[PDB]
Amino acid sequence: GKMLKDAIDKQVAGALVAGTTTSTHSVATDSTPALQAAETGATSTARDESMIETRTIVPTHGIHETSVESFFGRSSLVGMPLLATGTSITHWRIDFREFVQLRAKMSWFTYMRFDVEFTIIATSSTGQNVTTEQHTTYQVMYVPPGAPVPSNQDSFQWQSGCNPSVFADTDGPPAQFSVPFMSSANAYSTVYDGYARFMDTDPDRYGILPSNFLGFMYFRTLEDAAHQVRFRIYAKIKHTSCWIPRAPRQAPYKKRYNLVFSGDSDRICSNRASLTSY
Amino acid sequence: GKMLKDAIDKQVAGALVAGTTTSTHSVATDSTPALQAAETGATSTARDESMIETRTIVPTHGIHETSVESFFGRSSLVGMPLLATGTSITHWRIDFREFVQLRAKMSWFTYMRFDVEFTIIATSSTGQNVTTEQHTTYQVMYVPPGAPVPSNQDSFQWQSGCNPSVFADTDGPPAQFSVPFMSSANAYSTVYDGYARFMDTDPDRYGILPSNFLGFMYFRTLEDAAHQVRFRIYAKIKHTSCWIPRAPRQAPYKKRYNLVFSGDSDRICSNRASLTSY
Amino acid sequence: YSDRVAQLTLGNSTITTQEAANICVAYGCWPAKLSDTDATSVDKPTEPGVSADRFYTLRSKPWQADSKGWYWKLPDALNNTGMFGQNAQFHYIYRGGWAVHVQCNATKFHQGTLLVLAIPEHQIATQEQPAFDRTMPGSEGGTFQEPFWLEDGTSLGNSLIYPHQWINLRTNNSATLILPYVNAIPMDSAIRHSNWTLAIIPVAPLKYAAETTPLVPITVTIAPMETEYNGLRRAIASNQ
Amino acid sequence: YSDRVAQLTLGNSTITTQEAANICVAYGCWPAKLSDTDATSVDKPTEPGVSADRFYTLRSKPWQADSKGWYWKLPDALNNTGMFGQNAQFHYIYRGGWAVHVQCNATKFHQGTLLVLAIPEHQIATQEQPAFDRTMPGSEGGTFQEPFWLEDGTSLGNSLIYPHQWINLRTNNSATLILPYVNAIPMDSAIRHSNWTLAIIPVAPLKYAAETTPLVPITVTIAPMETEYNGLRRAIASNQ
Amino acid sequence: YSDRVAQLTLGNSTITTQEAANICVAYGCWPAKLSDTDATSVDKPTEPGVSADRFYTLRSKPWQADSKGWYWKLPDALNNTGMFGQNAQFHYIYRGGWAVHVQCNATKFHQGTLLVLAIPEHQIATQEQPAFDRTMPGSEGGTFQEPFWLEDGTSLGNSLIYPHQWINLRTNNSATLILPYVNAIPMDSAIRHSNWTLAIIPVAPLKYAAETTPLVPITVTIAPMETEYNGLRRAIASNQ
Amino acid sequence: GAQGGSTINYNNINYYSHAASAAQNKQDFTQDPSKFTQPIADVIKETAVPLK
Amino acid sequence: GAQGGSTINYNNINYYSHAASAAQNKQDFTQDPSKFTQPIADVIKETAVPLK
Amino acid sequence: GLPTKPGPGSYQFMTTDEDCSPCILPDFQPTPEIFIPGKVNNLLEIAQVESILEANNREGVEGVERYVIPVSVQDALDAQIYALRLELGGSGPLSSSLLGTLAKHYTQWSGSVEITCMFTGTFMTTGKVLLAYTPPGGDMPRNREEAMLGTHVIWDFGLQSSITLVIPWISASHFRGVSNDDVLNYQYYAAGHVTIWYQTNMVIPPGFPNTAGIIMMIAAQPNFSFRIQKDREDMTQTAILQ
Amino acid sequence: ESILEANNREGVEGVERYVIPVSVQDALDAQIYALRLELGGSGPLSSSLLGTLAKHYTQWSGSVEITCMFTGTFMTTGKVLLAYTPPGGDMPRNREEAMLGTHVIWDFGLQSSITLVIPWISASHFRGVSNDDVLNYQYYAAGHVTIWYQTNMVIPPGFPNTAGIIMMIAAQPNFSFRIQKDREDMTQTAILQ
Ligand SMILES: CCCCCCCCCCCCCC(=O)O
Ligand SMILES: CCCCCCCCCCCCCC(=O)O
Ligand SMILES: CCCCCCCCCCCCCC(=O)O
């Protein structure tokens, strides 16, 4: 049926890399492809065929593993809240900045528009952190800014009449759910050269764009936990638009909410004793 | 729909064995099918019908169980890493050379192009190796050459932002996944008459083709293991192209990364006391 | 026929250079006004025209032997200047592009190379989160302290991904960049957010054919382009 | 009409034999040049033509009563010989086929049989991993120590799967094999990898109609065929 | 539009110059292969292609105050270099043209003029018949002792009849000459006969705007062109 | 796609209502490298001299 | 195939995007035994004498 | 959700499953397939290639010599040269050949087999040989008179060095068992006997070698097939390879 | 194009690591620079845009180009030889050996910059990015880039006798990457707070 045709999108990865045309020797004063001028800011236009004698090469290699979708389109850890047994409650602030691998991958772009698939793995363990048996339901509640936060395991906030929740078992399959692009802005921002507030220039609000922050995930067990639970929160970025590539992060990350780095030794690649030998 | 027709391939195993035509007696000097010359390197051309008087036989037997696909197209053990409780981490180097049955089956060919279905069975046991109960998630991370290896159970490498991982339960169904033909070469090589490196002829790099080596699988439990875990790694070879058949391995295998054999008693079949009796 | 000679006329103002390289147009995107499909603010914008879309010259900088570099936030650097500055002060939100012209002449007896970066959303840090005098330095601009790290934990070497030109003294005395508006929203406040940073970083140091080092200034000239303003209220000068 | 008489003309060189069996063409594949669809290296290959595509004769070997066999790696055996050798030394990568001709005459008063194997990717081992003097023995070739196991833990009996002929002294005095290029990649280094091994193994020992055993040499003659070379640099002779 | 900027691409090698004069093509004759009507040798030639038809750079020479000049025989100078050298060693006879590029840069603060002669059949003498170290000096080349007489009892002034360019330091830093094969026979031996001599003779001496004389090298770069070789045998390096 | 070479051909079938539920997009989209490599007002053809 | 004799007839249905995900191929492919059994320049018909 | 009923066999792993499974690298684009000579689509292309029988399996013969059956000048008439039980399984001489090693991977076989023999004596050495195939039911034929009653070829040594005895598929059933499994009485599948006899004698000129050789070779005919993969008996290991 | 951290000599810090020294020579045919062609490891190519992308991938194919910009005074002249040597041996020892490879010859002048195109010259369709020792990924050795004085750097009296080359690198349109992998040098010992 055509109605089911609406739920199917045929999508194709068949873009190839550029090929090579055979070329011959050139002795002239007409064509000088090797002479360049980096001052313009343009990258060199010279190609293989104009610099040496080439054979013909039919293109066969795809480019799809470096499409922005493929590069971001896998799951990565973004949150690891620990539910202790004293209160049986925990939360994770929602952003991709606690764990460095996804953050550094995002640092190649300025603005990014995407959806998210979240995946939550819960693991129970003892005080000495050895795996242990515990079968219990847990509740993950999305708490958006301005909604009252639960303060206990039995708080009546966990009613969840308006906050969306997911209920799953600690020893069941992983909870998984998708999320549309939720920013009030038309993209997310990986970096922000401004202040979070008018009438304020506190350093702690520099580089803080609050339209990236959609709130909190809160976690309880539905009864009081017998053992601590660790939730691992994975995000896969999908349906991805990217704008304005950047110099990628090179210094290690130090803080969650700013770009501070050490910068004690100004170098990235390793040293050698002489430029004319390895 | 035609779009779903793209995801279906009708494929048929109906090739038959050769039949037999009836023949009669031949008394001539014209046709001598039994006279051969093995010196040319050609196999004998003489057939049944030209050597004896045959009846007619309609072909009925298939050949599909000896198609290269069917011969390789089943799962075999290729790796058995043991996760101890001291570090809760282990790894398996990815190649089909630890276990002899698959390796000997591959030794019939020189070059082989295939995909792989991997299947992982995890089993928990005590120190005395008796089966025991342990419910825990584990993580298998593909670590390709040049990616930093995890050194502990809690290493931040297990973030897995760019390495693909599979998470499954020790007492759940077996993890299973497919893999395309990944060699930088246009086929894999079962045997290599060369050196792994320029400017080096060390015996330990003879017969080593590093384009067969796609890296490592690393294994942790998501908490610290209470009992040791044994992962059994099965590979099924599929979508298989094979070139250049070989004399198959006859001496037992001795080492993982070379063809060394004992060769103390030069024979394969068993002996008898006389060639004219059994 | 000659991309070494250029003339830039905006408003009542005209720049010339006899040693340009070319003109960099960032992301191949000439500045353009906001379309009705992307716009959200319902009030009718003020478009000041030539009163603001004109070249403004900042104070010059001496290129010294030890210079690490200089930077300016936009619109920050022009927020107190002319009718651009006044339109930016009197409106809540602003949008527009830039025409940037960096001047530095020296002799055929000099050597040295400047890198001229226009960096969008150039959030900066060092070993510490920066204060307001560095995030929004005004018309006088700021100076780099970690030019190798591009003040942001990235690397100067990879900043050629950003729109740029060089001033290599053997070749040219000026760099020109045309910048489109870049943001994740249609308009944004001029006092709270800097959409672009103009960064001028010495890569090859300045050397003279004698040991006596005369004064070689760097001079920045910036024209706003295709500007709109919405949200008229009293004039507010800074985010403090 | 007669596949016992052959003539092979390559370059300035011509072989004849009045007792051939036939000609073995391995896998029914005549050597052929690399097509644009399978090629990866972008530089234009050098094709030396007749300067290299010609028969080269190696030094002869005596067939002794105790002989276990002989072997040569290709291109290894010809890497220091003629313009083939020079083109292989001066390029990073090489591709091509072979025309192999093994000569051994004896009398109608002799008996004995040689097996003549062309073995692709013939990686060798014994009770130990072999040294360079055995993996790449050069023009003089190596000798078998485990002829029953084909130096590789397989069996000589099953090596008829490889392209082969016999020299059975009652029948023929020569074997001819045409070998296509075989590899898992389009081109490969001549000094680092041997695509084929020519193996000559006595199966029926050499017997004479007297007890006085005159000298019966074996002689190998090899012509490269349809050669290409890419990656021109200085000449490099061996992988050591 | 500009005969001051040139690029020469042969094989895997490319030369550029931003101060050329033009390109001299000797006798208006681009190098060309030997036609069946003029050829005598019946064997099929080897044509090595890009393996030999490429630029080779000789060692540089210092231009000193007293320099009388330098010279190289061709093919002599390249007979031990690369795959050209190997093809010339392994064949009895050879034919081909040349692409010659002489480099010498100095300053706008220098003066001096080089004459760059390609002299066909340049047989040399002085008060004595010359020895082998002067008739065939190899890659290092020889030096003039009678530059006024062009080493041959003629005159330097009249050698403009030969194909030539100047390097006048106020004008250009490089000379390019394309040379056809010249001989009285179709092919000839590379080790016994030199068809061309590249001669670089200072006419106006080298003067600097100070008395301190920095190093000003001359550098020769030569590409064989349209080469053929016949008469394949062992490699023979020199006529000694 | 039961295989052309480097052509992955996929029918993304979303079972849920919201487009955000769909799996990741496998299309190759247009590449305009020249907005980053040739970001200049006057085109400079490869065979020309860049300056002047 | 609800059965012809020795004809297995299969509709391989791949549910995933990558062709590598598909199950194993059940086609019988062409057999050219003679590239290995008759690898000789001159064909020798069965009824002829091989040598000469 | 669609109502379902998972049944028996849920979550099992069968090694011969034919199921699609998620790809861990769904965006990967492999290197093209290039032309390589000698592509094999079916292992019966290998089984039709002749290989040498390890035929001289007498106790004490080692190495290459196990491949040459002795043939001598006889001093008595109608003598026996060779005897061989026709078996693709077990451990006798056929078991180590190309066909025999493939049969090690399979449980059942059908079709005709051919044996090609090459004489290696001097040019001047003459002889005639009887090659016999005896269908099953009894023992190995005891004399040439009994062996000749079966399928047989008679070989004249000459310019054409080699002969073929085609062992035709003669069988009560469409298939036989490869193995000779005793507990299962797979001797039920006994496939007969191959014997070689002097038809006249080997004759030599004075002072020539009085002993020469036959190199036996075996291969499958085009009517041959195998069923039921099974593990190879003699490809074992006591430890993981390191 | 991005700038190579090419002047990686021990003791050079900061922006100066981006300028290779070029001087007036007192001897002929001297070497300016040497560089092992490698997208992996930790040498100068590893910190560039192409090198940092290669940190996320396991395999690479295609041609690479290196653009060099001279920074001496207008009056400073020179000619330079830029060589690419395919693998099999060591780094070329002298300009005579290096010239036997792919090479361009650069004349300092009005057009400030030159391109040496390093063409994809390779036995296989793809190479390994990394130099993983246990796995012998040195199998994928991709050759050498060296820079030589073709004539000399020449200056008027009393000018700076030292100038610089800024090396720049980028991929050609025939280039690609396979197999995502984790970046080696982007680590953390703790969750960020
Ligand atoms: C739990 C359902 C609603 C949660 C919304 C999650 C959306 C996350 C998008 C994060 C984008 C900004 C990333 C960052 O600031 O580093
Ligand atoms: C875990 C996902 C990526 C792993 C890639 C596995 C591919 C294995 C192919 C092995 C082919 C070579 C076999 C061998 O060397 O013996
Ligand atoms: C429950 C309804 C069944 C519909 C699913 C049919 C299979 C999914 C289509 C996959 C399309 C791409 C597969 C491929 O050709 O690689």
Ligand SMILES: CCCCCCCCCCCCCC(=O)O
């Ligand atoms: C969920 C969509 C259902 C489609 C599956 C229909 C059954 C699979 C087809 C099997 C085709 C070969 C079976 C046979 O005839 O032997």
